[PDB]
Design an enzyme around this catalytic site. Sequence first.
Site, PDB file in Angstrom:
ATOM      1  N   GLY A   1       0.761  -1.215   0.000  1.00  0.00           N
ATOM      2  CA  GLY A   1       0.000   0.000   0.000  1.00  0.00           C
ATOM      3  C   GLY A   1       0.809   1.293   0.000  1.00  0.00           C
ATOM      4  O   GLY A   1       0.510   2.191  -0.765  1.00  0.00           O
TER       5      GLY A   1
ATOM      6  N   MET B   1       4.864   3.086   1.864  1.00  0.00           N
ATOM      7  CA  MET B   1       6.111   2.850   2.536  1.00  0.00           C
ATOM      8  C   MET B   1       6.766   4.177   2.958  1.00  0.00           C
ATOM      9  O   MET B   1       6.881   5.122   2.150  1.00  0.00           O
ATOM     10  CB  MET B   1       7.039   2.105   1.564  1.00  0.00           C
ATOM     11  CG  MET B   1       8.455   1.872   2.117  1.00  0.00           C
ATOM     12  SD  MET B   1       8.320   0.766   3.543  1.00  0.00           S
ATOM     13  CE  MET B   1       9.738   1.468   4.451  1.00  0.00           C
TER      14      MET B   1
ATOM     15  N   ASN C   1       9.672   5.527   3.466  1.00  0.00           N
ATOM     16  CA  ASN C   1      11.088   5.791   3.286  1.00  0.00           C
ATOM     17  C   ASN C   1      11.410   7.254   3.672  1.00  0.00           C
ATOM     18  O   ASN C   1      10.673   8.187   3.286  1.00  0.00           O
ATOM     19  CB  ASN C   1      11.552   5.522   1.854  1.00  0.00           C
ATOM     20  CG  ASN C   1      11.051   4.214   1.303  1.00  0.00           C
ATOM     21  OD1 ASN C   1      11.470   3.147   1.720  1.00  0.00           O
ATOM     22  ND2 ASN C   1      10.138   4.299   0.370  1.00  0.00           N
TER      23      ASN C   1
ATOM     24  N   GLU D   1       1.980   6.725   7.072  1.00  0.00           N
ATOM     25  CA  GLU D   1       3.379   6.771   6.708  1.00  0.00           C
ATOM     26  C   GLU D   1       4.063   8.012   7.306  1.00  0.00           C
ATOM     27  O   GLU D   1       5.214   7.937   7.727  1.00  0.00           O
ATOM     28  CB  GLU D   1       3.605   6.703   5.208  1.00  0.00           C
ATOM     29  CG  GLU D   1       3.085   5.423   4.519  1.00  0.00           C
ATOM     30  CD  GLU D   1       3.219   4.068   5.268  1.00  0.00           C
ATOM     31  OE1 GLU D   1       4.160   3.890   6.091  1.00  0.00           O
ATOM     32  OE2 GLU D   1       2.377   3.147   4.988  1.00  0.00           O
TER      33      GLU D   1
ATOM     34  N   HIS E   1       5.036   7.397  10.963  1.00  0.00           N
ATOM     35  CA  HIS E   1       6.278   6.601  11.082  1.00  0.00           C
ATOM     36  C   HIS E   1       7.569   7.428  11.123  1.00  0.00           C
ATOM     37  O   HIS E   1       8.638   6.902  11.469  1.00  0.00           O
ATOM     38  CB  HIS E   1       6.459   5.673   9.855  1.00  0.00           C
ATOM     39  CG  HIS E   1       5.804   4.335   9.979  1.00  0.00           C
ATOM     40  ND1 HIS E   1       5.972   3.516  11.083  1.00  0.00           N
ATOM     41  CD2 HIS E   1       4.987   3.661   9.131  1.00  0.00           C
ATOM     42  CE1 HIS E   1       5.284   2.403  10.910  1.00  0.00           C
ATOM     43  NE2 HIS E   1       4.700   2.459   9.733  1.00  0.00           N
TER      44      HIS E   1
HETATM   45 ZN   LIG Z   1       3.326   1.193   8.714  1.00  0.00          ZN
END
Ligand SMILES: [Zn+2]
Lengths: 4, 866
Positions: free
Chosen positions: B257, B259, B261, B294, B297
Amino acid sequence: XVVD
Amino acid sequence: PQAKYRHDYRAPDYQITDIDLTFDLDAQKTVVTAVSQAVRHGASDAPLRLNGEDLKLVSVHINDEPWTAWKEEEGALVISNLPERFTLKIINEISPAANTALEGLYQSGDALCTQCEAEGFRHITYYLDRPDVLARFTTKIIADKIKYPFLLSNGNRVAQGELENGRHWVQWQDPFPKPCYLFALVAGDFDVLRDTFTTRSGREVALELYVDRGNLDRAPWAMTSLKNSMKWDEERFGLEYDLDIYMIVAVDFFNMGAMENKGLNIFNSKYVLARTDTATDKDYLDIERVIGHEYFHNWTGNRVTCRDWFQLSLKEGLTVFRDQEFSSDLGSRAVNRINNVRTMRGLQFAEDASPMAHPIRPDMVIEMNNFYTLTVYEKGAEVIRMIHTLLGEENFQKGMQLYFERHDGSAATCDDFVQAMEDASNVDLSHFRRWYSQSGTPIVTVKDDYNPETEQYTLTISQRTPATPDQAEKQPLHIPFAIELYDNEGKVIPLQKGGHPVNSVLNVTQAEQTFVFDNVYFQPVPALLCEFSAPVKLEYKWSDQQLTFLMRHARNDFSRWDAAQSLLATYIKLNVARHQQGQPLSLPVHVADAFRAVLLDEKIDPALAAEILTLPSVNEMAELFDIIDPIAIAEVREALTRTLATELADELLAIYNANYQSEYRVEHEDIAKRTLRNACLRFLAFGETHLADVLVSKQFHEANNMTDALAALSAAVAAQLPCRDALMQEYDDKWHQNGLVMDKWFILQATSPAANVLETVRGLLQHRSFTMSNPNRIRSLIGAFAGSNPAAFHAEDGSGYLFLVEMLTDLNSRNPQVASRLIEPLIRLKRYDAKRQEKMRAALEQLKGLENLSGDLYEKITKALA
Ligand SMILES: [Zn+2]
Ligand code: NA
Ligand code: NA
Ligand code: NA
């Protein structure tokens, strides 16, 4: 990660 | 392929502190040059073991000296006789065009892009591909200027140049040490939406959203959600973005779905692109939740990362909790809690009784990409939420602050996080830690008693967790067990004992425990496990009248919905048993009446009413049973829908019309009304056929937005209405060139209740909008069939199983990560009847026999056949  | 175990964790013999990468990019053959500064911490005789997969090594130098003391083994380059500090230079080649697994560096259309989590960086160069090794990256990219005018990596553009022969380069630098799972690289041609966000301390962040040429029109919602995400994290958690630029790239070809980065998120284009004519309310809310996720995170994943992959939940559970709190603060808290609880009881519970059951912190793993699970994510978050429930917001925030203060800039463990919460709050979470090591769903059994002589209410609460396939030993957990007691007027009775208030979150820490409350001046109706206070199965002997009373008076809207679920549950079970005996649906008049009252209550929040009028899915229904009969469940959902349609037709219609909205807005009140309206439509579609067909065809054609169009199209398929084929044909004619929009149509085809659905699905493998090269298309046709049409997937002839075997025989070789998501339905064989189970077992046995069986499938199959 969201996977789907 | 062999299992790794959490208790085998050891600190690495070597660290890398800095890595300078150069990519001479080309789709056929990319040459990678990696200069790492390394430090030995272990013994002189211990070699440096670098992971690498499908790499062609060109050379190895240590301090500029060509190195002769090394060898290649399976998946590694082992280098001996190193000094304490040195520079490692590796040159190697890779081939993006050949990468159909989409792990490491690969093509998405004409773009090149990366996916490194969990263990993808080792498909790019030989490295210490483990997340306790953190390094400062600088990334130089060289490519054809015409094919690849945008060359992006983590951090800031610090250098650039033009070369001969139409080539150019760009070099990036990211000042924050990171594990390599968080490296990204993107090369392509894009339209770019540019905006800015000023943090609360005044840092101006440039925001850049890269999308394929032509899609700039679908980008502003994602940018708006990103800004909302940055702002919420400031307000709620006190966290600011820590870089100058924030890039997101939307790609069509992605196993995932999205990420996180660092500074360069890569997103599946389903979680970015939205326009009112292509995207539903649900797509908008998802984009908002995933962009936020995301983004969250950045702290919970990047600034504090994971010491090893068994600690995945440290980031995914906590970050899920964050994205849930974000969605809940911005939208309807009740609707969010409701749907997250639907997922928990209906999908995560199923996992926790399956062969793949694991604790939120796994002990054993063979392929780590198999552990991005409902358990790690959703139960992970429920575990965070329980900590929150025990500590309260203020203490929870203090523990967050201590977590960062201690671990900022390093890789941590679940136990680190618990420890911070404990030390900051002074709440003892020793026993609580057992939620990280024990799998399976606890059963909490409640018995009560009211004593009118002493005005005491007594709760006897007991727990047990059954054995799971992975663990034979279970023990009691520390279960936060929230209650409210209601009097005969619908008022809350103060909780008290011996003339002292009592906290309404009870600490259920033993196998069996009694709590006694005083001054309970009337016999109470209890609300138990309020807001789903722990991720457990509640066993309590509710009466119907207690449940309907809670539907009417409970303080929290979640509890009103939950009571209604408990009310239905009794009748779902009843009617599944009936269906097996060839009997039709039986439903008490008073249950129908409770739903009529919700439809006609003018004070009820429409968002709440819509959820109460959205029947439990076939998956939630399935967890009510030890042995699953998927055909009886599907048929019983349909019949219950047909019966409420008939009993409530006039009220349904009236509420449908009253909620008409001429303007389309992505705003929470509008979405609530729309969701209620389409919930009524759903019922109406299963009522009198001619009205049904008229309402549905008309809504489809008049809709000014995809939410309303899809709700109609979907009801036409679900109820098999006369207008169905024409509407399906129209949608295809209009939307075939648009993959994401077609995904919805594929889902509808795959989940059709029609008798010939499998035949239609097979034929759609040849559809112009379908391709096995695209994970979204695959998930939308094949995954939806297998996972979301259990009636047809479990047809008694076993045709569903044979179809899935055939698709997995392809995908096992092509894209094992996708294959592994798709096999999940087959590994639940132990929940089915003997005959189905035999056929699923033969199917699994056939896949087990494949040549070049991927580890991803092997892990699941062998657990399933044990
Ligand atoms: Zn996650
Ligand atoms: Na390091
Ligand atoms: Na809210
Ligand atoms: Na009782």
